[PDB]
Amino acid sequence: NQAIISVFIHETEDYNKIVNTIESFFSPLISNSKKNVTTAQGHYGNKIIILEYRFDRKSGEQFFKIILEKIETSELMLILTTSHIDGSKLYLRFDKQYLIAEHRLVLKEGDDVIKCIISFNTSNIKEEIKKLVNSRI
C-alpha cells in the first residue's frame, strides 16, 4: 500500500555516512523511491535534517519484504511479540548506530532512529510475519 523511511540527522552525525548506508542497504529498490531532504533549525544555528524516502505501492510490499529478508529472526520475533501499530500502519524504529556501523537492523525505542512506516489495507497483520517467523525457524 505504501512505505516510508524517515530519519532526523543532527549536526554531530555524519549525514553522508547515513545516506549512503541507507541508500545502499535498501539498494536497489530505494533507487526507485522519492527522496526528500529538509533542514529545520532554531534561532541559534541549531540545524536538524529530515531525510525521507517514499515507496509507492509497487515498491511498498517489496520494501517490507526486503526488511524481512534482512532483519535477524531475533528482532523479527521481537516485532510480532509486539504496540508498533496505529491504524493500519506499522512503525518499525531501527537503530541508527547498528545500521551504519554493522549493517544490522536492530529495533530501538524513540524517534531518534531510522523509522520505517508500512501501511497495510488489511489489519490480520500478525499472521503473516508469524508464518514467516514460523517459517524461518
Numbering used by the authors: 4 to 85, 88 to 128, 131 to 144
What do the authors report?
UPF0201 family proteins constitute one such uncharacterized, archaeal specific protein family. The UPF0201 family proteins occur as a single globular α/β domain with approximate dimensions of 55×35×35 Å3. The protomeric structure consists of a five-stranded, anti-parallel β-sheet, five α helices, which are located on one face of the β-sheet, and three loops connecting helices and strands. We have further documented that all members of this archaeal specific protein family share a common polypeptide chain fold, which is evolutionarily related to the RRM motif found in the ribosomal L5 proteins and many other RNA-binding proteins.
For 10077b and 10077c from S. solfataricus and S. solfataricus P2, respectively, full-length constructs bearing C-terminal His6 tags yielded crystals and structures. Our four UPF0201 structures represent subfamilies N149845 (10077a, b) and N130963 (10077c, d). The crystallographic asymmetric units contain one protomer in 10077c, two in 10077b and four protomers in both 10077a and 10077d. While 10077a, 10077b and 10077d all form one type of dimer (typeI), 10077c forms altogether different dimer via crystallographic symmetry (typeII). For type II dimer in 10077c, the interface surface area is larger and equal to 982 Å2. At the type II interface the turn connecting -strand β1 and helix α2 interacts with the turn that connects helix α4 and β5 (residues Gly115-Asp117). Majority of the interactions seen at the type II assembly interface are due to exchange of strands β2, β3, and the turn connecting them (residues Gly25-Asp50) between the two monomers. Moreover, this part of the structure in 10077c is about 5 residues longer compared to the other three. The interactions involve a large number of residues, which include Ser9, His13, Glu14, Thr15, Glu16, Asp17, His46, Asn49, Glu55, Asp116 and Gly117 of 10077c. Despite that the type II assembly involves large number of interactions and presumably more stable than the type I, such an assembly is seen only in one among the four structures reported here.
